[PDB]
């Protein structure tokens, strides 16, 4: 369950948990895992340029808040079969702030 | 203005005049140029991990089999500033046989 956070502290948290795979800016490189920019309202899989597992693209999730908030907490409980190397942000307090920067930072 | 040809000549011809830029397979990566995957049916400057020039962006265009085969003829005119450095497919035939290929490898 999604709540606006704090959009400071979630670019402080994406810079320790997820920058180190993950660019947000348009045009933005893809590198360990895909560019963010305009995921929410985009199907799991469908970043152009990308090879992704085929987990991740048969789950076929249309991104919003909520689900990512439900997908972040654990990714390989969400995506069986998924190659993101993230055990879970397990804070819903955390998942609000990084949610509500990423959210922000991918428009 | 588009009227089907021939894909496997079509094949070819992406081999000797766009796969030094481009790939077509989801998944496939982003070289000079990027990935067409899904191109068609997608406005132009849209593929995520890529970085388009404001040019390709502001044309905005909606990806078609006609307009497609338009801006083949020459790149340059048809969206003056872009960074694709290609003369142009001039021979009708060629981009239709192109674009019938273009249209099964990329979806
Ligand atoms: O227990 C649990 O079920 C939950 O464990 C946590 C998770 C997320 C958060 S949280 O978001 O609220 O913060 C907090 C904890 C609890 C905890 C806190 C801290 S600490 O107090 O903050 O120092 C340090 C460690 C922690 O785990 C204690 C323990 O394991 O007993 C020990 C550690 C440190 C580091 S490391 O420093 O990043 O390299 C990495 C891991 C760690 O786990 C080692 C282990 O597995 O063996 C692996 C791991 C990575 C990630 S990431 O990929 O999402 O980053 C998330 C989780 C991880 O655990 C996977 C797993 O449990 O299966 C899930
Ligand atoms: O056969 C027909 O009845 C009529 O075919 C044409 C001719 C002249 C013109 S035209 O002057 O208005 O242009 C237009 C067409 C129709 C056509 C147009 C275009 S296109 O839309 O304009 O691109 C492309 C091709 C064309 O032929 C479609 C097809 O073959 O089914 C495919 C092609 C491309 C090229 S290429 O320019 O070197 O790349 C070369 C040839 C091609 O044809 C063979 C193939 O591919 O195997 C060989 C050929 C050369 C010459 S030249 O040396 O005397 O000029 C004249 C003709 C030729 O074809 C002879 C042959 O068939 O027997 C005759
Ligand atoms: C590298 C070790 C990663 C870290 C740290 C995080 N992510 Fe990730 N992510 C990574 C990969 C390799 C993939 C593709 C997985 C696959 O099975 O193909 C992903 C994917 C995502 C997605 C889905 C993207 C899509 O287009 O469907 C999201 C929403 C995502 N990652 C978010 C994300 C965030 C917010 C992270 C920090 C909290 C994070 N990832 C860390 C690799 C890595
Ligand atoms: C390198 C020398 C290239 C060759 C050869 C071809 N393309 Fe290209 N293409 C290239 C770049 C650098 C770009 C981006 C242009 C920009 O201004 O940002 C492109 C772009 C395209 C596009 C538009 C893609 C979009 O998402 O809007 C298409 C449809 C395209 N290229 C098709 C294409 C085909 C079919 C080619 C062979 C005939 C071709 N390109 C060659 C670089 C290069
Ligand atoms: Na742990």
Redesign the pocket.
């Known amino acids: 369950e999604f709540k606006a956070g704090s959009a400071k502290k979630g670019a402080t948290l994406f810079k320790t948990?997820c920058l180190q795979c993950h660019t947000v800016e348009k045009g933005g490189p893809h590198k360990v895992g895909p560019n963010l920019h305009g995921i929410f309202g985009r199907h799991s899989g469908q970043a152009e340029g990308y090879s992704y597992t085929d987990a991740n693209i048969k789950k076929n999730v249309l991104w919003d808040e909520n689900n990512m908030s439900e997908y972040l907490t654990n990714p390989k409980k969400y995506i069986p079969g998924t190659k993101m190397?993230?055990?879970?942000?397990?804070?819903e307090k955390?998942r609000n702030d990084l949610i509500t920067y990423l959210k922000k930072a991918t428009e």
């Open positions: 948990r190397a993230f055990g879970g942000l397990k804070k955390d």
